[PDB]
Amino acid sequence: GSFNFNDEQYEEFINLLDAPVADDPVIEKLLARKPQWDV
Amino acid sequence: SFNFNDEQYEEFINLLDAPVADDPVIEKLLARKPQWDV
Amino acid sequence: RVTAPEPLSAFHQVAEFVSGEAVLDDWLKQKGLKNQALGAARTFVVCKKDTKQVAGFYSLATGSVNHTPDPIPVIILARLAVDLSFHGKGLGADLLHDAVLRCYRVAENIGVRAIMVHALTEEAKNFFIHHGFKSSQTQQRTLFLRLPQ
Amino acid sequence: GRVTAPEPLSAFHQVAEFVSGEAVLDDWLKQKGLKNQALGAARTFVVCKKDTKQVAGFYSLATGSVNHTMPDPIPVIILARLAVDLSFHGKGLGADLLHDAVLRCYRVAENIGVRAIMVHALTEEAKNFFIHHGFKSSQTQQRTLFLRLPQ
Numbered sequence: 001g002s003f004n005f006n007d008e009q010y011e012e013f014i015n016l017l018d019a020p021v022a023d024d025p026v027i028e029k030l031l032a033r034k035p036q037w038d039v
Numbered sequence: 040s041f042n043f044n045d046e047q048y049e050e051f052i053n054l055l056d057a058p059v060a061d062d063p064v065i066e067k068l069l070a071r072k073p074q075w076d077v
Numbered sequence: 078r079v080t081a082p083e084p085l086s087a088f089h090q091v092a093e094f095v096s097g098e099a100v101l102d103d104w105l106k107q108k109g110l111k112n113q114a115l116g117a118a119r120t121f122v123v124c125k126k127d128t129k130q131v132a133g134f135y136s137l138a139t140g141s142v143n144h145t146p147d148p149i150p151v152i153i154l155a156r157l158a159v160d161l162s163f164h165g166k167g168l169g170a171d172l173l174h175d176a177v178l179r180c181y182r183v184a185e186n187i188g189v190r191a192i193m194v195h196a197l198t199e200e201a202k203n204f205f206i207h208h209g210f211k212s213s214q215t216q217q218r219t220l221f222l223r224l225p226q
Numbered sequence: 227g228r229v230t231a232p233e234p235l236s237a238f239h240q241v242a243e244f245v246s247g248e249a250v251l252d253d254w255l256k257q258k259g260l261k262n263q264a265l266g267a268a269r270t271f272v273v274c275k276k277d278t279k280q281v282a283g284f285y286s287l288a289t290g291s292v293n294h295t296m297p298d299p300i301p302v303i304i305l306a307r308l309a310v311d312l313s314f315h316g317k318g319l320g321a322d323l324l325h326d327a328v329l330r331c332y333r334v335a336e337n338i339g340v341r342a343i344m345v346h347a348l349t350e351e352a353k354n355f356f357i358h359h360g361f362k363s364s365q366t367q368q369r370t371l372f373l374r375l376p377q
């Protein structure tokens with residue numbers, strides 16, 4: 001144990017924990033949908 | 040705006056504080072039925 | 078083949094807008110601009126390209142949930158409508174896409190916790206269920222979508 | 227043939243004839259497994275051939291922390307080891323052990339609040355086994371992977 005992280009190791013890790021939370025696949029499809037004005 | 044009764048409020052708060060969903064790959068791993076419960 | 082959503086202005090032509098739900102069509106024509114100016118509700122429209130004729134729209138409004146604990150802020154997706162000329166052409170889901178992403182950005186800046194919907198018909202309810210909204214089992218035709226954080 | 231449900235490594239388990247393909251893991255099991263089990267340094271779960279105590283596969287969970295030297299502590303679970311005996315390769319046992327290991331770390335997270343599983347991959351074929359099952363590859367350290375745990 002007791003692994004020691006530099007500033008960007010620690011930051012990468014913190015960003016993985018606090019990362020944009022996932023959602024249900026139907027909701028994920030809705031967010032991924034490319035609308036008829038985005039060509 | 041909106042007044043919720045105790046059951047309405049509870050359903051709502053349980054939806055907010057509900058566990059975060061898992062990555063679809065990870066969800067498959069958690070759902071896996073392993074070769075020892077055969 | 079339709080323009081990107083833009084905030085409702087007095088220059089948008091909404092007089093000949095027909096969705097199939099007259100309550101929504103009447104709100105747009107008679108209350109859209111007033112609420113835009115009051116800030117009570119924010120309406121976004123899509124137009125036929127190279128025109129200002131409204132093909133579809135939705136309205137976002139701020140609300141709060143209280144217990145009969147300080148109030149919990151939510152966004153109300155008050156309205157979403159497509160003109161009958163554009164029905165079943167995937168525009169309704171394109172507007173819901175835009176509406177939900179917009180509510181994600183609002184959540185990041187003021188911390189609203191959920192999108193709330195009060196469906197008028199039970200067919201409207203199933204439009205939202207089909208796109209990942211959760212149906213309240215303690216209230217009729219009320220749906221929720223949890224927002225990040 | 228058939229294999230037993232995971233159980234904690236005990237003195238009754240036969241580990242002398244265990245070969246995974248990675249010698250460092252096989253040596254740790256035979257020479258350090260029981261001692262660390264008793265000390266509580268790392269905690270090893272084994273699957274055996276049914277009606278037997280011969281180890282077909284195992285993994286080790288250990289508690290660790292992510293630190294900055296002002297005050298920045300954070301507990302994590304270390305998946306220190308995961309190995310299948312070459313006799314049991316391509317029977318889906320490696321993924322069955324990872325399934326068990328991750329569920330176990332979910333239950334640990336519910337009770338002590340560890341934030342993530344950390345994995346230090348030795349071979350780069352092992353790295354891609356974890357990526358294939360949802361683990362995220364660190365870009366600031368080579369062969370280090372993470373899985374966020376609930377809460």
Ligand SMILES: CC(=O)SCCNC(=O)CCNC(=O)[C@H](O)C(C)(C)COP(=O)(O)OP(=O)(O)OC[C@H]1O[C@@H](n2cnc3c(N)ncnc32)[C@H](O)[C@@H]1OP(=O)(O)O
Nearest residue numbers: 155157158159164165166167168169170196197201203204
């Ligand atoms: C009351 C409130 O707060 S908002 C209520 C909703 N609005 C209304 O009821 C107003 C009148 N209705 C309308 O304006 C429209 O018909 C809407 C909003 C219901 C949908 O508009 P449409 O243009 O028909 O939708 P669109 O073509 O984008 O539909 C795309 C997808 O939604 C599905 N869908 C559309 N309406 C429904 C419905 N009522 N139930 C289930 N699925 C539906 C389509 O089948 C399609 O699914 P798929 O891509 O998986 O095959």
Ligand SMILES: CC(=O)SCCNC(=O)CCNC(=O)[C@H](O)C(C)(C)COP(=O)(O)OP(=O)(O)OC[C@H]1O[C@@H](n2cnc3c(N)ncnc32)[C@H](O)[C@@H]1OP(=O)(O)O
Nearest residue numbers: 308309310316318319320321346347348351352354355358
């Ligand atoms: C110290 C540490 O960091 S522990 C990690 C390092 N471990 C080792 O090096 C030990 C030596 N190797 C082994 O014991 C094994 O070969 C392992 C653990 C790497 C893989 O376990 P196995 O039992 O061989 O794999 P299994 O048959 O269960 O494979 C299941 C899945 O993994 C995938 N997989 C297996 N090996 C690999 C690989 N090298 N790269 C990517 N995916 C892989 C398969 O494609 C399969 O996916 P699928 O079910 O969707 O088709």
